Every structure is written in C-alpha cells, then in structure tokens.
Structure 1
Amino acid sequence: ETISQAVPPVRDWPAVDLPGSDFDPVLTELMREGPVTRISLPNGEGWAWLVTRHDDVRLVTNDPRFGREAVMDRQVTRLAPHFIPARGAVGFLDPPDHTRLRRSVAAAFTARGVERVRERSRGMLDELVDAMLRAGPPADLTEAVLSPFPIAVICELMGVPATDRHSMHTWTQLILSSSHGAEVSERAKNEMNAYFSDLIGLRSDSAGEDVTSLLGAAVGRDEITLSEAVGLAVLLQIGGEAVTNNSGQMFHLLLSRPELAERLRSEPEIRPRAIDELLRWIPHRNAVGLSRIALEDVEIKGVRIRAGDAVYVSYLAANRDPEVFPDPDRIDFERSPNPHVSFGFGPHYCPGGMLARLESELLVDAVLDRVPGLKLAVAPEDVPFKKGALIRGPEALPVTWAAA
C-alpha cells in the first residue's frame, strides 16, 4: 500500500477581527482541508483536533468518549486567555454530574417553560422601544433595545433584582470581553460567583419560580451543591446576553438586505422559521469555544484521535455543511428542515435555545412593526463590530426611522 499522510499540518488560527457577518477565511480553509484538521489558537499551548462536518460535530459532542472535566487539568490551546466557566460549572461537567445539574432547571427552559414569560417579556420590550421612539430617531439600536431587553429578560428569569442588572451586564461583558480585552475576566468571574452564591442562599432558599429560587430549593434538598448551582447560574446569566450580539447581527443583516426585511415585514407568520434560518447562518462566534478531551482513542474520518488529545468542533462550520444545507451560504427562510447546531449539540446543548428564539421573535416584531421605517443611519460597512470578542456582533447599531 502507498504511504500517504493522514494527519494534516497544524494551522495557526490567529485572532482576527472580522467585519460584520463575513465568514472566517481560516475556517473556510480548514473546512476544505479535511473533516479532521489540527489548529493552534492564540492562547494556551499545543494544538487540538478540529471537526467541521455536521455529522462529525454531532458525534464529538454527543459521545461519552469525549469529556469536559478533563479540559481543566492541562491548558488546551484556545481563543480566550482564561476559561469562562468555573471549576464546577456545567460547562466543565460530564454526564453523571452534568445530567444531574441540567435536570434541576430544565423545566424553566423548555418551549412551554419560556412561553410563560412571553407576554411579560413583550411588555418590557414595548417599554424599551417606546422610550427609543420618544427620545427621537437618532439612536443606537443595541444600546437602546438589543442590550437592555435580553438583560432584563434573563435577570427576571434568574430572579436578579432590577437594580443589579447593570452589574450583571458589566461582569458578563468583561468575562466575554474578548477575554484578552484584559484579564479582569477572572476577577469578573469571581465577583459573579460571589453574587449568585449570595442570591441562591439569600432568601431564594425558599419559594419562587425564578431559576435562582429553583436552584436554592435543589441545594436545600441536597440534590446539587452550592458550587454546582452557582456555576450553572453564572453560565446562564452570561449566556442570556448572547441574544444581544446575535439579534444585532440579525438586524444588521436584515437592514443590509431590503428583500429579507420586506419579506418579514409583509409576512409576520413566517418570522419564526426565518429567524431560525438566520440563527443557522449567523456566525455567532469567533473561532471555537470549549474543547473536549478524548477519554480513549477514537477514529474519525480515517484519523486516529489519541486519548488525551483535545478536540474542538465548530458549530459554525457544521451549519455550512453543503451535504446537510444545500447552498449553505444562502439565506433561505424556507430552507427544508435545516437541523442547524447554532445552539450546540449533545448533553451541553444550549439550555437557552428556546428563550433565545422567543427573544429574537419578540424583537423582530417590535423592531419591524413598531418602528415606522427603521433603517441603518449609516452605510452597512460603517456599522462597528465588536473588536476582540468571543461572541461576534455589533459594537453599536446606528439607526433612524420615518418618525423624525
């Protein structure tokens, strides 16, 4: 048999700030280089395997042979200089303990669970849009609505007092502050942990329907520990703001493509399906996030991943799999059943998925039918996008409307 090379060379993935919603050039190359590539990220040390195919991504994220707990030991090559989740956060937990934790709050995040805050959220959103409308056209949609709304929704769901929403925002953005935007990210985390530790123990150690109350109850019943409860609460709190960045890309996109905006304006009933297609297409993050370690040797597409090897999956690349989504780069609100993985896959799939779709749907209705002829106040490429960040998205979204 002819001797051939199955292991591709390590490709350095330097931190680059991509304009708007353009797809990452490097990722594109990795995708065509092969199903299983190897990469080197800005921080950490060494390399890690990278799986970009929709089928292999589902495998690596839904297989017990790959774990999260083992990532804490060494320091896998990564984007952020620090690790976002705490030692016992669900992010770093594996099935046994992980299943126990996710179970404690799953009821609050199902389609039926979030639909309960539907009307209430709609009200909070109308207040924010009403204030933007009252202040006069010239406005930053992100500062006026995209940031405030998601913050208020997750704080109300978590049971965080309105007076502390400002603190939640500051810490979250420092922890996700490109992580390399500084190093107070670690301090930010500590302060967030301390905050939820108090909240979960403070009063919430009784009745309530909010998540910290539910967690307080579970800790009280010895079902989960306080550290587990806190790590999960913090990840949920930071995750809540992901809608700010994502919807920001949604509106920049919509306002950049009149045909897409016109279709949603005239057909409010197709909005749910459209948003889901937008969720598939939108490049939610820079590079990759949290790897998994091979707990034993595993062969993927003719490549042997050795036990101890770190492996990343790219949900963004999986969402562009030509075999799963024909004409991947094309935005088709009709697109067949499109099983996108923007909300992840496997046990760690995003508990906030349904809430994010609910928030995006409420936002689309309000922004399109509540604001008369809203449009970018500047040329599409002039819209600033977060420089140095984990979750891509507008730095600010300058808009104006027919009113004034």
Structure 2
Amino acid sequence: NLAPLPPHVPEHLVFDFDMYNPSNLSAGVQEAWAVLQESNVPDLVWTRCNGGHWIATRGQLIREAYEDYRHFSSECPFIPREAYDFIPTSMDPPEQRQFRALANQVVGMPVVDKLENRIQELACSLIESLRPQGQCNFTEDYAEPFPIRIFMLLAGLPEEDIPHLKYLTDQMTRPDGSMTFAEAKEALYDYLIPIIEQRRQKPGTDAISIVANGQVNGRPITSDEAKRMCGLLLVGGLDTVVNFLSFSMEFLAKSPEHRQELIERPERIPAACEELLRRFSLVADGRILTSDYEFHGVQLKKGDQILLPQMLSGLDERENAAPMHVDFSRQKVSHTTFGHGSHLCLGQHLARREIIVTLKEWLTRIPDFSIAPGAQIQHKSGIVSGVQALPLVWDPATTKAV
C-alpha cells in the first residue's frame, strides 16, 4: 500500500521507509531508523508509505525545520494525516506561547525540584516490591506504573483513580477495541471536567488547580482549554517515559561494563542519562507545509507532510562521532530527544529526574541484573518507538534491602 507519487516529487528522492514497520526492526529500532543515514540516502527523502510524506534524515535539517514554524506547521503533527485536540500540540507560535508558559508553571524545574524526593520514594517502593522476586518484566512491573503515579502526585489525584485513568490512556495509544480514540479522549474529559470545575472554586497548589485558574488572552482559561492542556500533561509523560526507561534498562542489562561504570561512579549518572537520551531517542513527530517552499534544494508543496524524527538528530554521525557507541564521558552530547524549537518538551525536566532517580535507585538496590535466560527483546516503531517487554533476572542475595 504505497500512495502514488505526487508529481512534484522526483523519483531519485524516493525511499519507502515505513515508520510503523521499518524493515530492520529485529536489529533494534534505532538501528532500523538509522538506515536513513546510510551514505546512499539523501538528507531529505520521500516515502510512499503511510499516505506519502517527506522525511528529513539529518540533524541539521530536522533542527532547521523545527525552527521554521512559519513553513512547517504543527496543525497536523502526525503521520498519517488521520479527534486529537490536546493543547498546545497543534498550535503554532504565537498562539502557543501563553499556553506553554502556563504548562511550564506546573511541570517546570522549580516543581520538579520540589517533587524529586516523592519521585524517589515512589521508585524505591516499586523497586523494593520487586527486589526479593529475583525477576520482573521491567516494562510492565516498573516502567508502566511509575509515570502514571508521578502524574497523580503532580495533579493531586487519588491513587484509587489509577486503574481507570491508565486504562483510558492505554486506549489512546494501544486500543484493545473497547473504545475508539474519541471515546477514550471523551472519557478522559468526563473525568477531568468535574475536577477542574471544583478546583476553580476551591484551588490547591497541584497542577490541575494551577491550570484551571490560569489566564489566557487577559481572560480566564476556559474549561475546554484546561481539559485539553491537562490531557496533554497526562499523556505526554507516559509512553515516552515507559519506553525510554525500557531502552535504558535493556542496554544496562546487556552491557555489564557500562553498568559497572555507574555502580562505581554514581556521580556520572546525570551525564549517563544524557548519553542514553541521545542513543535511545524514540520520538518521531512531524509538521505540515504551510506553503510551497524550496528547502535545501528540494521543492516542498503546500500541504505536504514531513516527518522530522527527533530520534535521528543524535544518531547522525555528523552530530556525534561513532553515534551507535554509548560513552557516558562524551564531552558534547548532541541530540533533539525532547524536540527542538517552540514545542520543545515541557516535561523534559521531570523526565530527566524520573530517569536519573530510576537509575540511581535501581543500581543501588539491584546492581547486578541480566536479561532473562533465553529471552530476545523485541522493539516496536512509530511516533513513540518502544520495547515490547523486558524480562530481567537477578540473584536476591546480591541486592540491598530497604
């Protein structure tokens, strides 16, 4: 199912990469995407998969396109072109600036600094519950429960609401069929709306209270705007963190030498986090052309979609030498893992703290662990690439109890 080549697209630029099922997937998802950076592949290519779209394959072009919001609009940020209404995903500057500022009040650095110890306590509780078992599926047993619990903390929501909320967010990205995306989204709004209304009347210092009482265009934020922002604050931090933590733990389970480095020098963990963010980058979003535009010698047409994979910038050998090698001592770790330009991840500070806290606590309590005997780790590819499951094993006698 290749879409017919639009007549403005020259055949020599055609490379039929399928972002949802890349051909090299069993070799690892980052490796599968990195085929776009082989020397026979232009900086900018067209694929006929998934409706047909451009792909920028190099960090220079990926960065430039994210900077040039006048040409590359977020109005349609996903491939393929086909109910999504979260804020401020689909907004271009200048509409976007006010909403970002508000979201920044609830997940910005000062909030992350205040929450850090709570995040650690949560990580500790999860790890301690798994420690004596000598095994887990890390993706399911630690990664999945962790970010949703951090959201409940950030948003001041009771833990009793977790199973239902997690179900709704799971339906938006991995539907079992019980709910369409639109139904899942509306159920999420059914949940958030009463809470937003109550906290407009009786505010706390939690994220929902702050969003609900925010100001837009010199007037109060509307309930519709508030639910759409809260929805994004919820979903934006789930699959990205789950899968990223899984890539990192897979690598650490498989590379005892890198693991030992962090055991011996825990102070290097924040730098290691940055290098892992580069090597195991996982997002691939896009933009839509606002007008006909010649970009690096290539004629783009108004309405063309362009995939601008955040994942690829840091894997580009032009940005980082020997880019598939993990080296926690890199003097310059170049990446766009959290994006670039006006939509740069608002959760980047929270995410890094989640990653660093997880690694610190896991290496403290369970320093020696491996991939389960016999297991082969499977990746998945898409807008957020990921790990299907991560069976880990360890000897409880080598662990340190709480």
Q: State the TM-score, normalized to the length of structure 1.
A: 0.86
Contact 1:205 1:216 in 2 (8 A): no
Cα distance change on mapping 1:217 and 1:165 into 2, 3 Å: same
SS at match of 2:214: helix
Distance 2:26 2:141 in 1: 22
SS at match of 1:56: helix
Distance 1:22 1:294 in 2: 27
Partner in structure 1 of residue 326 of structure 2: 331
Aligned runs of 1:3-402 on 2, under 5 Å?
Answer: 8-9=13-14, 11-13=16-18, 15-16=20-21, 18-19=25-26, 21-25=28-32, 28-29=35-36, 32=39, 33-42=41-50, 45=51, 47-68=52-73, 70-71=75-76, 77-78=79-80, 82=82, 85-86=84-85, 89-134=87-132, 136-177=133-174, 184-218=180-214, 222-241=219-238, 242-285=240-283, 288-289=284-285, 291-371=286-366, 373-379=368-374, 382-385=376-379, 390-402=383-395
Letter in 2 for 1:303: V
Distance 1:292 1:319 in 2: 19
Cα distance change on mapping 1:67 and 1:168 into 2, 3 Å: farther
Shift of 1:14: 6.4
Shift of 1:24: 4.8
Structure 1 unpaired stretches of 5+: none
Contact 1:6 1:302 in 2 (8 A): no
Distance 1:54 1:166 in 2: 39
Same amino acid, percent of matched pairs:
24
Provide, for residues 263-285 of structure 1, a one-character-per-residue CA deviation record: whole Å limited to 9, x for no partner.
11111000000111001111424
Shift of 1:26: 5.7
Contact 2:29 2:379 in 1 (8 A): no
Shift of 1:209: 2.0
Distance 1:14 1:322 in 2: 21
Cα distance change on mapping 1:7 and 1:227 into 2, 3 Å: farther
Letter in 2 for 1:399: L
Cα distance change on mapping 1:383 and 1:303 into 2, 3 Å: closer
Letter in 1 for 2:300: I
SS at match of 2:337: coil
Shift of 1:12: 5.0
Cα distance change on mapping 1:338 and 1:199 into 2, 3 Å: same
Root-mean-square deviation over aligned CA pairs: 2.8
Distance 2:282 2:255 in 1: 19
Letter in 1 for 2:165: M
Distance 1:238 1:20 in 2: 28
Distance 1:193 1:338 in 2: 39
Letter in 2 for 1:271: I
Q: State the TM-score, normalized to the length of structure 2.
A: 0.86
Instruction: Please list every run of at least 4 consecutive aligned residues from structure 1 whose deviation after the TM superposition is greater than 6 angstroms.
Output: 179-183
Aligned residues: 384
SS at match of 2:161: helix
